[PDB]
Amino acid sequence: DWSKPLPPSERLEQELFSGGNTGINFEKYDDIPVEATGNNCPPHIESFSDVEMGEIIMGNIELTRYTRPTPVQKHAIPIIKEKRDLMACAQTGSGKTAAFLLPILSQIYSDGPGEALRAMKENGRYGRRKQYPISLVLAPTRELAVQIYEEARKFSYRSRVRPCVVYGGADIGQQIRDLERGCHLLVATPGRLVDMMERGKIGLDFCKYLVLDEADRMLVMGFEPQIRRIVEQDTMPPKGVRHTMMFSATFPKEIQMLARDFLDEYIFLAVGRVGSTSENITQKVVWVEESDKRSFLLDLLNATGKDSLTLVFVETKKGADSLEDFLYHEGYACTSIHGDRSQRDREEALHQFRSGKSPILVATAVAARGLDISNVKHVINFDLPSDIEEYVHRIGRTGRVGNLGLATSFFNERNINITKDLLDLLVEAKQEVPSWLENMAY
Template sequence: MVSPLLKLVLLFRLPTRHRSLFLSNSSQHQTPPTSQSQQCQQQHVPPQPPPHPLMRNATGQPIPFHMPPLHQPPPPMPPQGFSGRHPPPPPHMGIPPPMPPPPLPHAGMNGIANGSGTGGGRQPLQQQLGGNGRWKGGGMFDSSPNAGGPSRFTAASSAAGGGGRQQLMSRFQAASTPAAGSGASNFQPSDDWSQLLSRNERMERELFSGTTTGINFDDYDSIPVEMTGPDRESIQPVESFASMTDFHPVIGNAVKLIGYQKPTPVQKWAIPTTLAKRDLMACAQTGSGKTAAFLVPILNLMYTEGPGHSQAAVRANRRKQFPVALVLAPTRELASQIYDEARKFSYRSQVRCCVVYGGADIGSQVRELDRGCHLLVATPGRLVDVMERGRIGLDHCRFLVLDEADRMLDMGFEPQIRRIVEQDTMPQKGQRQTLMFSATFPKEIQHLARDFLQDYIFLAVGRVGSTSQNITQEIMWVEEADKRACLEELLQNRAPDALVLVFVETKRGADQLEGVLYQQGFPVASIHGDRSQADREMALRNFRTGQTPILVATAVAARGLDIPNVVQVINYDLPSDIEEYVHRIGRTGRVGNLGRATSFFNDKNRNIVKDLRE
């Protein structure tokens, strides 16, 4: 018991607002009540903690306040092997977790079922229910050749016990798609390249939609073709693609999807020459289908002959890729174009194509190489860089192609080319097959052909260095001060959807002319060497699709670009030599189409008058 005097002292020490509460609480403890535990036992209710004396609601009723216990029970021990970094998963209350369903093919995979696990008999994936309804079946998810699926899923089932119970055994193998331009890491394709893989409708739409080639070149039969070299009489021309029974099914399927019917003159002779495993030096007019002239026979030989020792070398040295075929091109635009065509002719095959070029992130290109590379398209400078990093080996390269060889020499790539071909591990001439393509045949190209080719066939289609007969050439005398007004007049008189390519000499001139035309309301874009790769690709893509049908360009776009349906080429600034003029106007009148080339001429261009007359 507390004495009244002590109560009085305590009362005066409390704040005024708490005195009434103190008095009420003290009066309640005058009669000792029954213990709370005894009351709970009598009423069979769980014990409740008393409300806090200082917490009441507006009506004066105490508000329950549950104090946490002073001593918390220790947390349950994590299961064995648990790292403790994250909280343990909640228990399942004695109920086992449901069995996860088998993985389904994602958007980049092509479901292929193979009853035996290997070999043929590929059919659309089927799931069967057996016994208690669990998934059974032995089949294989295999990434499509062009779909970009990152893995291959293999499943096998075996009966175990009664009641139709099935045992599912699965494993994931990191494998890349064996197709052009897609895949995943640790690429381990089959050594059998003769198989025709299943269709991928999404990839077909991506690769072959909008294809405009496959034109009959009936008027090309009159073009003279000169062919020299040892045993040239044994090579017979290809009259039509349908008559080529030696084509592998992968090539035949691609030719059908593209729409090829009758080959161009260079294809007519280059394809059988390459299939006969002869070295070739071909000079042909620009826009005559030279890309397919070397891709079709080389890939056909790769499908029939297989990878050789390249796959074994990759398995022995996983950090380095050993391509079977190498295609060198002068510019990144041409390299990208060749790569896109290679993807078409490698569709539904085990062959994977890659491309490397300067002006783009080398890290992403190296990662693509790590996923597998059988046919490599590259610019010389970037290829040397990748080789010095130890990511590409040319020890097992059986096919070498130099496209636009004269342009590569003009751009100063001869040291890099000789470094790649002569000073590394590439097989010597005679042990590899080498093809060179060029629009001209100057002395420098003749020396390169002598050093790189052995017993080669020389093929000249039409007059070497001449322009296409499908191009109507127009020369206009225009003073420098009147060029912009004359150009605007030509552009206003064009068809709304006609693609027009305007060439200038300098990068600064390209930017200035683009700005002037844009201010006049023309849909225009420009490309030159100082633009980033992303900007150049976007400008070319918009030009091809017609979003910006006027493109101002320097010589970076003059060679090798295959932009179909270019109606007119305008030389706003004439080049200084006739070879550059030939390559520029060759961007129109391609693959059998008609085109027009208009050139502005004045006193500054008198040095090219004689060559233009010829």
């Protein structure tokens, strides 16, 4: 039924596999180790043939030119196939996307869509009420959300499963109409999925496969609330019933606590460094009285040069303004993220920060919550937050895979509380620790 592939189509098969020509770095990954922790963990696999992937998957794997499974894909696939929860850490290019889509799809085709859906299509309840995805993949940004989606279209070619993606900063009405056309594997970004839900367009009652792609990156952009609203606060099946998978390069305490509540008797999969923060990111904490702050920032900027971008965080919108004011006044090409405005207009203001025009960007925690501010070499904490949690996804905005970024933070009496946590964080990340910091912790 859901296992026996439907008749092909050239026009469609052409659209989905436009040559591709893109293959993963298949030689500099086999050099990286893959540790798998957990009880009675299902033994990894060598070839996609080491487990019944079903007709359709095996078929589509060919049309996408995949010979054998990447490293992570060697341990991930059999883990998901034997229906075990998973927390996986691996750097981009590892082949994470295919690692969760394949086994998941292979399962739907195998097990079918569930009796709820089955006995709901054959029920004269025709129309466009509410769609219930069988699998949900939460993603941090529209860029990645769509890549995943594209990937799903390929692997779900010639099956009863219609993939569908939604995200913010687009006409919701259009996306809503797209949902109405079919949902089985919905890929979405936290905020939008919640919006769709409130609008009664999506239901999570029959979601059996939950995947949080780049959980750490999602939290950075301040999504935790929705993620929990989505998972814990709704019609979604509890753990043990639904199968969950988390994917994230870094493994901070806020992700450990997330993997804790969401995953169930899960296997930890790490293919490299167990980073508490991004491996490639430098942290310099310096003591600066409030008065000396602006001048200190200025010296910091003159040095900046580098034809790089600088993201400057402050604590209040009030000061984000007076500082943005101060910086324009001193003759600096800087802009400011508007909190109030929609994230559609906000993703616009960044279009000019990006092209050099204004290498300086001053924003508060809130104001950027939701935005994908990438391409930033220097993140400076003009003010520090109350929690070391915030600190983490604040310095997160920099050091994106490939090149190293810098995160300078001004620290003074005003935040002696977050002392001990900041110290530990630096010890862990093996950063330089100011003697005065150690002293002010007892």
